[PDB]
Curated annotation (Swiss-Prot):
Protein name (Swiss-Prot/TrEMBL): 3-phosphoinositide-dependent protein kinase 1
A Gene Ontology biological process term: positive regulation of protein localization to plasma membrane
Organism per entry: Homo sapiens (Human)
Chain's gene name: PDPK1
Modifications made to the protein after synthesis: Phosphorylation on Ser-163 in the activation loop is required for full activity. PDPK1 itself can autophosphorylate Ser-163, leading to its own activation. Autophosphorylation is inhibited by the apoptotic C-terminus cleavage product of PKN2. Angiotensin II stimulates the tyrosine phosphorylation of PDPK1 in vascular smooth muscle in a calcium- and SRC-dependent manner. Autophosphorylated; autophosphorylation is inhibited by the apoptotic C-terminus cleavage product of PKN2.
Subunit structure: Homodimer in its autoinhibited state. Active as monomer. Interacts with NPRL2, PPARG, PAK1, PTK2B, GRB14, PKN1 (via C-terminus), STRAP and IKKB. Interacts with SGK3 in a phosphorylation-dependent manner. The tyrosine-phosphorylated form interacts with PTPN6. The Ser-163 phosphorylated form interacts with YWHAH and YWHAQ. Binds INSR in response to insulin. Interacts (via PH domain) with SMAD3, SMAD4 and SMAD7.
EC numbers on record: 2.7.11.1
Residues of the full protein shown: 71 to 359 of 556
Length: 281
């Protein structure tokens, strides 16, 4: 099998900086021959080698190549010169989910339901292929032109075959105690997102990381008075201190029961990406 010609920087007309990470820079670029917009992640090798992020960059590449699903950002090509690596990723036109959370204050019942469903749909794929995100957050969940989700950031994800702490607010308690992450770590992260979509804020917030960590292990959060009752129950079955008792985990017998939850009564899981996402309040 012959892969398309190995690309090079000159093949593009670079545009605005979409995002700036710690080890990389993401710039919108247009391919010259095709006139296609790709978001090229640009990483400096010398800075990668010194910071020991060689595994992290490799893992990000390997995972995003393997994913073949609409709710996940596609890696179209990899190329490099002397000092830099270039990652040809898809361009999420609308931006962060967090962006749209802040913009509208909080999602209503239909909007939450729909976008919750898409994350579940995508998680079932990711965990089905034996990968654990470990850093799932509204910032990582991106939205394309038609306003569907496209989950990104897989450098820190864990691939299973038979050591890292994520963003403080969406961290599961078993990471802070046992140093061992599972599929259900993401399902904890899922519950926080469901809460955040309804409340407008994640469940655990404080002045610093330590106090946030403190509240998580103690399970210190509570619901507003208007919080959707069927969404509340789902969160309750997802934000559990014991990872084996979390709705959706292997001990809770896969994703079937999670999808079955009353909160997803009207949702047709058939073809969500072909469906039309609700407008945001
Ligand atoms: C929340 C911050 C933000 O807006 N980041 C830029 C996201 N836009 C974007 C991302 C990508 N790929 C993500 C690779 S890390 N492509 C196109 N636009």
């Amino acid at each position: 099998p012959p892969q398309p010609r190995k690309k090079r920087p000159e093949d593009f007309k670079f545009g605005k900086i979409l995002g700036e990470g710690s080890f990389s820079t993401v710039v919108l670029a247009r391919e010259l021959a095709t006139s296609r917009e790709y978001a090229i992640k640009i990483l400096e090798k010398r800075h990668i080698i010194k910071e020991n992020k060689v595994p992290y960059v490799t893992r990000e590449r390997d995972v995003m190549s393997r994913l073949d699903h609409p709710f996940f950002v596609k890696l179209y090509f990899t190329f490099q010169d002397d000092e830099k690596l270039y990652f040809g990723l898809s361009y999420a036109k609308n931006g962060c989910l967090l962006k749209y959370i802040r913009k509208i204050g909080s999602f209503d019942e239909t909007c939450t339901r729909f976008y919750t469903a898409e994350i579940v749909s995508a998680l079932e794929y990711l965990h089905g292929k034996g990968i654990i995100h470990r850093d799932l957050k509204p910032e990582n969940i991106l939205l394309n032109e038609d306003m569907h989700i496209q989950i990104t950031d897989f450098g820190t994800a864990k691939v299973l075959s038979p050591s890292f702490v994520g963003t403080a607010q969406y961290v599961s308690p078993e990471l802070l105690t046992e140093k061992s992450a599972s599929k259900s770590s993401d399902l904890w992260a899922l519950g926080c997102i469901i809460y955040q979509l309804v409340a407008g804020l994640p469940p655990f917030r404080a002045g610093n990381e330590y106090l946030i960590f403190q509240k998580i292990i103690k399970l210190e959060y509570d619901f507003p008075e208007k919080f959707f009752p069927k969404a509340r129950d789902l969160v309750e079955k997802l934000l559990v201190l014991d990872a084996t008792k979390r709705l959706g985990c292997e001990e809770m017998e896969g994703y079937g029961p999670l999808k079955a939850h009353p909160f997803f009564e009207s949702v047709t899981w058939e073809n969500l990406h072909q469906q039309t996402p609700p407008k945001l309040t």
